[PDB]
Design a protein around this nucleic acid. Structure first.
Length: 231
DNA sequence: CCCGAAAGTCCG
DNA sequence: CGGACTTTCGGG
């Protein structure tokens, strides 16, 4: 069965505007894990907009199908476009889509896709259905997959006052010994971000609990100004 | 415009 | 390590 015509149209239109010269450093920026067409975000969004203006957005019944097909295409701009498109179907996404989102996190995985999926899409779902957190987070933490572990750390990134502190610190405690850069950095990020809401709690945490040096210094990047740096 | 963030390199 | 910088993107 052929590619969805929307996807085919997107693929034709992107490919006609490819830039091999830009593609090389863009691919190097992602450690050469992916082929790139060499289209940066402002143009990529306009090209998508063009295809929607002509073909209209596919019926929601094809939403997951479109995302999968784009996900399977080799160049990274198609996963970036897939995430743009998924945003346009946001009001159709609910708790039943968590396994679908899991699957996106663990395929073609890198910080660009996972960071675009987790604090927004998964974050919003677990905010509305916090009782579902325990059906997924422990599995993610225990998995061999560092991107699921990073998802467990970052899904609360934007929660601000809705942050479950006990949960956040429990998750960090489970992952604080990881030697993985993307885990240490995620821990640093989520603490740095939460410190913008509750600096005292983050400060007390990092001064009294083991963290990778990277995690700690990223966490207190800003709030160290408020407490000072002891001799 | 600005700032802060993911990364990234380069250097001691 | 960790700081200083390159850098694209999102969000005032």
């Amino acid at each position: 069965v052929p590619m969805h015509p929307f996807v085919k149209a997107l693929q034709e239109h992107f490919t006609a505007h490819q830039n091999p010269e830009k593609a090389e450093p863009m691919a190097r920026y992602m450690k050469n894990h992916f082929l790139f067409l060499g289209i940066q975000t402002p143009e990529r969004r306009q090209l998508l907009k063009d295809i929607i203006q002509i073909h209209t957005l596919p019926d929601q019944k094809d939403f997951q199908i479109i995302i999968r097909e784009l996900w399977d295409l080799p160049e990274r701009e198609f996963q970036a476009a897939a995430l743009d498109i998924m945003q346009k179907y946001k009001k159709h996404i609910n708790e039943t889509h968590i396994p679908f989102l899991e699957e996106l996190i663990v395929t073609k995985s890198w910080w660009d896709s996972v960071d675009s999926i987790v604090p927004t899409f998964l974050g919003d779902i677990f905010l509305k259905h916090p009782e579902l957190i325990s059906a997924y987070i422990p599995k993610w933490i225990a998995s061999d997959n560092i991107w699921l572990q990073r998802a467990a750390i970052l899904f609360q990134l934007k929660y601000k006052q809705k942050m479950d502190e006990e949960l956040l610190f429990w998750i960090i405690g489970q992952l604080h010994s990881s030697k993985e850069f993307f885990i240490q950095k995620a821990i640093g990020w989520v603490l740095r971000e939460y410190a913008k809401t509750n600096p005292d709690v983050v400060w007390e945490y990092v001064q009294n609990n083991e963290l990778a040096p990277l995690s700690k210094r990223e966490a207190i990047k800003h709030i160290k100004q408020n407490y000072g740096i002891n001799n």
